[PDB]
Amino acid sequence: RPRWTLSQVTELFEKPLLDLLFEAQQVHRQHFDPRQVQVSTLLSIKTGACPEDCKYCPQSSRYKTGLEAERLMEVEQVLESARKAKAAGSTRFCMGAAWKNPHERDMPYLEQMVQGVKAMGLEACMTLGTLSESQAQRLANAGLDYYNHNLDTSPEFYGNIITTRTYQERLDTLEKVRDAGIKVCSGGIVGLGETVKDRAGLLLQLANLPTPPESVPINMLVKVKGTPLADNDDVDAFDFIRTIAVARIMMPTSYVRLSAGREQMNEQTQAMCFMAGANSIFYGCKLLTTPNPEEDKDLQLFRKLGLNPQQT
Amino acid sequence: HRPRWTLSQVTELFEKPLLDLLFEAQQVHRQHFDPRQVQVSTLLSIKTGACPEDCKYCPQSSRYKTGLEAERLMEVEQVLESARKAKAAGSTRFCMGAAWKNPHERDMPYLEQMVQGVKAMGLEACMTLGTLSESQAQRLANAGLDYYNHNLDTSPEFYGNIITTRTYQERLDTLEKVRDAGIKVCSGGIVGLGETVKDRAGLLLQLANLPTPPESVPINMLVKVKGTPLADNDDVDAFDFIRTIAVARIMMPTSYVRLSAGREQMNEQTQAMCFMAGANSIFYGCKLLTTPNPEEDKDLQLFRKLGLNPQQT
Ligand SMILES: C[S@@+](CC[C@H](N)C(=O)[O-])C[C@H]1O[C@@H](n2cnc3c(N)ncnc32)[C@H](O)[C@@H]1O
Ligand SMILES: C[S@@+](CC[C@H](N)C(=O)[O-])C[C@H]1O[C@@H](n2cnc3c(N)ncnc32)[C@H](O)[C@@H]1O
Ligand SMILES: C[C@@H]1NC(=O)N[C@@H]1CCCCCC(=O)O
Ligand SMILES: C[C@@H]1NC(=O)N[C@@H]1CCCCCC(=O)O
Ligand code: SF4
Ligand code: SF4
Ligand code: FES
Ligand code: FES
């Protein structure tokens, strides 16, 4: 099937914002039920001491960021929080480990977790890093509906942010999950230092794949004292907007999840975003380790804009 | 004569799922206007201060504190002066605004003389002097005046709680005087005076079901001013000041909806939402009549971020 050239995507990032937003909606409405948004709540199955060196992450053992390092929680502890989240109203549960790759000793537990979450009635999706053909097929057999694995940016920039991994090294993991028979959730971050071109490259990347990701998160950089990116220039909202617009147009059939950084965004913006095409969010006090808009505020905005039949 | 919007037909909109409403909005707007293109009018207060009327929201009302340096009508030069700096400044239409109930015959020669200079200076001329009368209108028109401002502020069924020194009708009368005069009508209202979804509805529904709805339809957001009885008021959720523009856009396609008064209080995104909503005119400058307004640069800058106009240098 036809793909996207780069000088074909840069076109968008250059298009008159407003007009782009229009096409955006135009598209979105042709493939999704507007006023309807996807709600996934996640927790950190295991947080803290992390090997890799992402210039943006606060869990990287490579930096200060004084983070209370915790150790993988028992299957109960997970299913516990999983429950409060189901009842809390979320549809999909997202466990996230702070690893490079899971360990064989882990699997039995990771597996056991998906079990409970899958039977509990909600969707199960975890992000454990680079899993391998074996692990995948195991997670899939257990249940896991989705797997998270981001590209963060253009391959031509991945270097300035992440080094402990091959840009390719990730692509490989997606396909492992693809063939595994699990849904792929892949996305990036905005405002790492990247440029209009870089971002372009990112979408352009996970866009020209065998079968683009079902869910495409677009996080806005969460500056954290310690991480080398901490002291960074904030991204004009309008640019974090446009990014969603492009993504929506570029992958119609895909769920664009306005995530990470909503807490920093204002009402209107999120509105702009949803309009832009964004149709999924993380719902809750916190996501992995940073702050997130509180359930109520979320629920309240959800209605102001008139999204969902989740009013009581 | 043509069709008229029912009320239970407009309340429908104010109830419609915001986002979806915004869509129709744009849908409509694009069918009657050149998006990415916005109208720029800059105004000044030909005469400010001591005002007779008692609008619960206005800071010029002689009825309240608001410590406003009361100034007296400026000479024709003083006006044309500021008028010039504003033309060069890049604005298209000039808007003089007096703080009167109605102009005085002694005024006219000067008001007339003003329109003269502004009209010849090369830009559009529009002034708001209150309730002018058949005579005055035809005089202003003969001089040049392209537009006349006269707002309805809200539903007739609420006008009372805000304004009392005038008959809701008393204004309608003035519009028509201007209509027949052969001048463009700029009529609009304010949001967040205390009004309710229904009230607002009534407002649009009002100036919407007229002989020929106003070319320009301003929609000001209430500017709380210490002193005015409205000062201590609940702020209006942006999303509601948004929706209001949406409805107006749909309800009067052929009309210019001017996002005005209160932009200074609004944030980037909102104005964006607004323009998208249908809003396509603004007041450009440091100040409008007496409150603060976003500075030319900030304006020009946002204008480009969103990609509006060929006004880039
Ligand atoms: C919570 S992590 C877990 C990643 C997993 N350990 C791996 O690397 O396989 C998933 C994504 O969260 C995003 N993220 C984490 N911390 C962030 C921050 N402080 N600011 C912005 N995005 C962040 C990054 O895009 C990251 O790849
Ligand atoms: C500058 S005034 C002059 C009106 C003129 N004297 C008349 O009565 O015909 C025009 C409109 O500005 C709006 N306005 C003035 N002050 C305002 C404020 N503080 N907040 C919101 N709107 C205001 C009101 O709708 C007012 O009728
Ligand atoms: C795993 C989820 N997928 C994603 O793209 N972002 C979430 C991770 C958290 C991002 C915000 C920074 C933090 O983790 O504290
Ligand atoms: C005359 C113009 N028409 C209108 O609706 N607003 C302008 C007047 C100013 C509104 C904001 C409050 C002030 O006057 O300072
Ligand atoms: S992002 Fe994933 S890999 Fe990079 S440091 Fe944080 S947890 Fe480890
Ligand atoms: S709004 Fe126009 S009329 Fe009402 S008090 Fe102020 S100047 Fe006088
Ligand atoms: S993180 Fe679980 S689906 Fe995107
Ligand atoms: S105020 Fe002069 S045109 Fe609306």
Structure description:
Chain A: Its cofactor is [4Fe-4S] cluster; [2Fe-2S] cluster. Chain A: Catalyzes the conversion of dethiobiotin (DTB) to biotin by the insertion of a sulfur atom into dethiobiotin via a radical-based mechanism. Chain A: Its EC number is 2.8.1.6. Chain A: Pathway: Cofactor biosynthesis; biotin biosynthesis; biotin from 7,8-diaminononanoate: step 2/2. The structure is a homodimer. Helix content of chain A is 40%, strand content 14%. Chain A has 312 residues and is of the alpha/beta class. The first copy, chain A, has one domain (1-312): Aldolase class I (TIM Barrel, Alpha-Beta Barrel). A 6-stranded parallel beta sheet of chain A has the order 5-4-3-2-1-9. In chain A, β3, α5 (133-142) and β4 (146-148) form a beta-alpha-beta unit. In chain A, α3 (75-87) runs parallel beside α4 (107-119), α4 (107-119) runs parallel beside α5 (133-142) and α8 (196-207) runs parallel beside α9 (237-250). The longest helix of chain A has 15 residues, at 17-31. The first copy, chain A, is globular and about 50 Å long. Chain A binds chain B through residues 15-19, 21-22, 25, 29, 34-35, 236-238, 266-269, 271-272, 274-275, 304-307, and chain B through 16-20, 22-23, 26, 30, 35-36, 237-239, 267-270, 272-273, 275-276, 305-308. One FE2/S2 (inorganic) cluster (FES) binds at residues 40, 42, 92, 94, 125, 146, 148, 185, 215, 217 of chain A. One iron/sulfur cluster binds next to loops of chain A.
